[PDB]
Scaffold this active site. Structure first.
Site, short mmCIF file in Angstrom:
data_model
loop_
_atom_site.label_atom_id
_atom_site.label_comp_id
_atom_site.label_asym_id
_atom_site.label_seq_id
_atom_site.Cartn_x
_atom_site.Cartn_y
_atom_site.Cartn_z
N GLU A 140 -68.23 19.97 21.81
CA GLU A 140 -67.32 18.09 22.09
C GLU A 140 -65.92 18.89 23.26
O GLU A 140 -65.08 19.63 22.85
CB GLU A 140 -66.28 18.07 20.53
N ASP A 170 -56.62 11.29 15.20
CA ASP A 170 -56.71 12.68 15.41
C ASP A 170 -55.83 13.38 14.47
O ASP A 170 -54.27 12.26 13.66
CB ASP A 170 -56.46 13.52 16.78
#
EC number: 4.2.1.20
Length: 244
Positions: A36, A47
Protein backbone atom coordinates in the site's frame (compact mmCIF):
# COMPACT_ATOMS: atom_id res chain seq x y z
CA UNK A 1 -5.10 -9.41 -4.74
CA UNK A 2 -2.61 -11.22 -2.52
CA UNK A 3 -1.75 -14.67 -1.14
CA UNK A 4 -3.38 -15.74 2.12
CA UNK A 5 -1.06 -15.11 5.04
CA UNK A 6 0.47 -12.09 3.31
CA UNK A 7 2.08 -9.24 5.23
CA UNK A 8 1.23 -5.98 3.46
CA UNK A 9 3.59 -3.02 3.99
CA UNK A 10 2.13 0.47 4.00
CA UNK A 11 4.39 3.43 3.26
CA UNK A 12 3.67 7.11 2.74
CA UNK A 13 4.91 8.30 -0.65
CA UNK A 14 7.72 10.85 -0.28
CA UNK A 15 8.54 10.19 3.39
CA UNK A 16 11.18 11.60 3.69
CA UNK A 17 11.72 11.70 -0.09
CA UNK A 18 10.50 9.73 -3.10
CA UNK A 19 13.91 8.12 -3.60
CA UNK A 20 13.92 6.79 -0.04
CA UNK A 21 10.37 5.49 -0.44
CA UNK A 22 11.56 3.50 -3.46
CA UNK A 23 14.49 2.18 -1.44
CA UNK A 24 12.18 1.04 1.36
CA UNK A 25 9.84 -0.71 -1.09
CA UNK A 26 12.70 -2.61 -2.74
CA UNK A 27 14.11 -3.72 0.62
CA UNK A 28 10.72 -5.00 1.87
CA UNK A 29 9.46 -6.58 -1.35
CA UNK A 30 10.82 -10.03 -0.48
CA UNK A 31 8.48 -10.08 2.55
CA UNK A 32 5.42 -8.51 0.91
CA UNK A 33 2.34 -10.16 -0.55
CA UNK A 34 1.25 -6.72 -1.74
CA UNK A 35 2.01 -3.08 -0.96
CA UNK A 36 0.00 0.00 0.00
CA UNK A 37 1.52 3.28 -1.12
CA UNK A 38 -0.11 6.26 0.51
CA UNK A 39 -0.46 9.64 -1.12
CA UNK A 40 0.11 12.37 1.50
CA UNK A 41 -2.72 14.83 2.11
CA UNK A 42 -2.94 18.05 4.11
CA UNK A 43 -5.79 16.71 6.25
CA UNK A 44 -5.43 12.96 6.89
CA UNK A 45 -8.21 13.01 9.50
CA UNK A 46 -9.02 9.32 9.01
CA UNK A 47 -5.50 8.24 9.95
CA UNK A 48 -3.82 7.68 13.28
CA UNK A 49 -1.21 10.04 14.73
CA UNK A 50 1.81 8.15 13.43
CA UNK A 51 0.66 8.04 9.82
CA UNK A 52 -0.71 11.59 9.93
CA UNK A 53 2.79 12.79 10.81
CA UNK A 54 4.25 10.88 7.87
CA UNK A 55 1.86 12.84 5.66
CA UNK A 56 3.03 16.11 7.23
CA UNK A 57 6.67 15.16 6.74
CA UNK A 58 6.16 14.23 3.07
CA UNK A 59 4.33 17.44 2.23
CA UNK A 60 6.82 19.61 4.17
CA UNK A 61 9.70 18.03 2.22
CA UNK A 62 7.81 18.98 -0.93
CA UNK A 63 6.00 15.84 -2.09
CA UNK A 64 4.01 16.22 -5.30
CA UNK A 65 1.11 14.03 -6.42
CA UNK A 66 2.64 12.48 -9.55
CA UNK A 67 5.86 11.67 -7.71
CA UNK A 68 3.82 8.71 -6.43
CA UNK A 69 3.61 7.37 -9.98
CA UNK A 70 7.36 7.84 -10.33
CA UNK A 71 7.82 5.58 -7.31
CA UNK A 72 5.50 2.89 -8.67
CA UNK A 73 7.04 3.08 -12.14
CA UNK A 74 10.61 2.63 -10.87
CA UNK A 75 9.52 -0.13 -8.51
CA UNK A 76 7.94 -2.02 -11.42
CA UNK A 77 11.34 -2.32 -13.10
CA UNK A 78 12.31 -4.71 -10.30
CA UNK A 79 9.01 -6.17 -9.12
CA UNK A 80 5.49 -7.24 -9.99
CA UNK A 81 4.21 -7.22 -6.39
CA UNK A 82 0.62 -5.93 -6.33
CA UNK A 83 0.41 -2.26 -5.45
CA UNK A 84 -2.56 -0.39 -4.03
CA UNK A 85 -2.46 3.39 -4.12
CA UNK A 86 -4.11 4.82 -0.99
CA UNK A 87 -5.42 8.37 -1.14
CA UNK A 88 -7.97 10.89 0.02
CA UNK A 89 -10.57 11.93 -2.53
CA UNK A 90 -9.57 15.60 -2.83
CA UNK A 91 -6.40 14.98 -4.91
CA UNK A 92 -8.18 12.63 -7.34
CA UNK A 93 -11.28 14.81 -7.65
CA UNK A 94 -9.10 17.83 -8.40
CA UNK A 95 -6.91 16.03 -10.95
CA UNK A 96 -9.84 14.28 -12.63
CA UNK A 97 -10.96 10.79 -11.62
CA UNK A 98 -10.48 9.00 -14.95
CA UNK A 99 -7.25 10.89 -15.70
CA UNK A 100 -5.82 9.84 -12.35
CA UNK A 101 -6.93 6.21 -12.64
CA UNK A 102 -5.54 5.92 -16.18
CA UNK A 103 -2.26 7.50 -15.12
CA UNK A 104 -2.19 5.15 -12.11
CA UNK A 105 -2.78 2.08 -14.24
CA UNK A 106 -0.12 3.15 -16.75
CA UNK A 107 2.45 3.46 -13.96
CA UNK A 108 1.84 -0.05 -12.64
CA UNK A 109 -0.81 0.44 -9.95
CA UNK A 110 -3.16 -2.54 -9.61
CA UNK A 111 -5.70 -1.24 -7.12
CA UNK A 112 -6.83 1.94 -5.42
CA UNK A 113 -8.26 2.82 -2.04
CA UNK A 114 -9.99 6.17 -1.54
CA UNK A 115 -10.18 6.66 2.23
CA UNK A 116 -13.09 9.13 2.13
CA UNK A 117 -14.90 8.36 -1.12
CA UNK A 118 -18.25 10.17 -0.92
CA UNK A 119 -21.02 7.56 -1.03
CA UNK A 120 -22.60 9.87 -3.61
CA UNK A 121 -19.68 9.20 -5.97
CA UNK A 122 -19.02 5.55 -5.16
CA UNK A 123 -21.10 4.28 -8.09
CA UNK A 124 -19.50 6.23 -10.93
CA UNK A 125 -16.10 5.83 -9.30
CA UNK A 126 -16.18 2.03 -9.33
CA UNK A 127 -17.47 2.06 -12.90
CA UNK A 128 -14.54 4.26 -13.94
CA UNK A 129 -11.99 2.14 -12.07
CA UNK A 130 -13.33 -0.97 -13.79
CA UNK A 131 -13.06 0.70 -17.19
CA UNK A 132 -9.53 1.90 -16.44
CA UNK A 133 -8.53 -1.57 -15.27
CA UNK A 134 -7.89 -0.65 -11.64
CA UNK A 135 -9.18 -2.85 -8.82
CA UNK A 136 -11.08 -1.32 -5.93
CA UNK A 137 -10.22 -1.51 -2.26
CA UNK A 138 -12.85 -0.24 0.17
CA UNK A 139 -12.44 0.57 3.84
CA UNK A 140 -14.59 -0.38 6.86
CA UNK A 141 -14.08 0.39 10.57
CA UNK A 142 -15.42 -1.08 13.84
CA UNK A 143 -18.50 1.13 13.56
CA UNK A 144 -19.38 -0.30 10.15
CA UNK A 145 -22.62 -2.35 10.40
CA UNK A 146 -23.20 -5.71 8.68
CA UNK A 147 -25.54 -4.16 6.09
CA UNK A 148 -22.81 -1.81 4.91
CA UNK A 149 -20.17 -4.55 4.93
CA UNK A 150 -22.29 -6.35 2.34
CA UNK A 151 -22.65 -3.28 0.13
CA UNK A 152 -18.90 -2.76 0.45
CA UNK A 153 -18.13 -6.36 -0.48
CA UNK A 154 -20.35 -6.24 -3.56
CA UNK A 155 -18.50 -3.20 -4.96
CA UNK A 156 -15.02 -4.42 -4.06
CA UNK A 157 -12.94 -5.94 -6.84
CA UNK A 158 -9.58 -5.89 -5.07
CA UNK A 159 -10.10 -6.63 -1.39
CA UNK A 160 -11.81 -5.25 1.68
CA UNK A 161 -9.67 -3.20 4.05
CA UNK A 162 -10.70 -3.34 7.71
CA UNK A 163 -9.20 -0.71 10.00
CA UNK A 164 -9.20 0.27 13.63
CA UNK A 165 -8.38 3.79 14.83
CA UNK A 166 -8.42 2.32 18.35
CA UNK A 167 -4.70 1.59 18.58
CA UNK A 168 -3.57 -0.83 21.28
CA UNK A 169 -0.53 -2.88 23.33
CA UNK A 170 -3.34 -5.30 22.45
CA UNK A 171 -5.62 -5.47 19.42
CA UNK A 172 -9.00 -4.19 20.63
CA UNK A 173 -11.90 -6.65 20.87
CA UNK A 174 -13.88 -4.23 18.75
CA UNK A 175 -11.26 -4.77 16.01
CA UNK A 176 -11.47 -8.58 16.30
CA UNK A 177 -15.24 -8.27 16.17
CA UNK A 178 -15.01 -6.30 12.92
CA UNK A 179 -12.81 -9.07 11.47
CA UNK A 180 -15.08 -11.82 12.75
CA UNK A 181 -18.13 -10.06 11.27
CA UNK A 182 -16.37 -9.39 7.97
CA UNK A 183 -15.26 -12.99 7.36
CA UNK A 184 -18.85 -14.06 7.81
CA UNK A 185 -20.04 -11.66 5.10
CA UNK A 186 -17.21 -10.95 2.66
CA UNK A 187 -16.55 -13.05 -0.44
CA UNK A 188 -13.60 -10.79 -1.20
CA UNK A 189 -10.38 -11.33 0.74
CA UNK A 190 -9.86 -8.97 3.65
CA UNK A 191 -6.76 -7.23 4.97
CA UNK A 192 -6.55 -5.78 8.46
CA UNK A 193 -4.91 -2.56 9.59
CA UNK A 194 -5.21 -2.79 13.35
CA UNK A 195 -1.83 -1.23 14.04
CA UNK A 196 0.15 -4.40 14.74
CA UNK A 197 3.53 -4.02 16.46
CA UNK A 198 4.31 -7.53 17.75
CA UNK A 199 4.67 -11.07 16.34
CA UNK A 200 1.64 -12.35 18.26
CA UNK A 201 -0.51 -9.67 16.61
CA UNK A 202 0.25 -11.13 13.19
CA UNK A 203 -0.04 -14.78 14.17
CA UNK A 204 -3.35 -14.11 15.91
CA UNK A 205 -4.95 -12.03 13.16
CA UNK A 206 -4.02 -14.58 10.50
CA UNK A 207 -5.39 -17.34 12.71
CA UNK A 208 -8.63 -15.39 13.17
CA UNK A 209 -9.24 -15.18 9.43
CA UNK A 210 -7.37 -12.17 8.08
CA UNK A 211 -6.22 -13.08 4.55
CA UNK A 212 -3.57 -10.43 4.85
CA UNK A 213 -2.11 -8.26 7.58
CA UNK A 214 -1.02 -4.73 6.71
CA UNK A 215 1.93 -3.18 8.52
CA UNK A 216 1.91 0.61 8.36
CA UNK A 217 2.47 2.36 11.67
CA UNK A 218 5.27 0.07 12.82
CA UNK A 219 7.17 0.91 9.63
CA UNK A 220 6.26 4.60 9.43
CA UNK A 221 7.25 5.17 13.05
CA UNK A 222 10.72 3.92 12.16
CA UNK A 223 10.84 6.06 9.04
CA UNK A 224 10.10 9.33 10.83
CA UNK A 225 12.68 8.06 13.29
CA UNK A 226 15.54 6.97 11.01
CA UNK A 227 14.81 8.94 7.84
CA UNK A 228 16.63 7.69 4.75
CA UNK A 229 18.51 5.21 6.95
CA UNK A 230 15.31 3.47 8.02
CA UNK A 231 15.74 0.60 5.53
CA UNK A 232 17.79 -1.92 7.50
CA UNK A 233 15.67 -1.27 10.60
CA UNK A 234 12.52 -1.84 8.54
CA UNK A 235 13.80 -5.23 7.37
CA UNK A 236 14.38 -6.27 10.99
CA UNK A 237 10.90 -5.15 12.09
CA UNK A 238 9.20 -7.01 9.25
CA UNK A 239 11.35 -10.02 10.07
CA UNK A 240 10.37 -9.74 13.73
CA UNK A 241 6.69 -9.64 12.74
CA UNK A 242 7.22 -12.71 10.55
CA UNK A 243 9.02 -14.71 13.22
CA UNK A 244 12.22 -14.78 11.17
Amino acid sequence: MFKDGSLIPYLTAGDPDKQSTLNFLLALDEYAGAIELGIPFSDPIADGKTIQESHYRALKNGFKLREAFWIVKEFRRHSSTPIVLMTYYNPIYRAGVRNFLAEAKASGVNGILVVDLPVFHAKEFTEIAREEGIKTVFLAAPNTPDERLKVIDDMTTGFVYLVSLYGTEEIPKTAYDLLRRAKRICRNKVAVGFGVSKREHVVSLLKEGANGVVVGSALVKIIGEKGREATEFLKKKVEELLGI
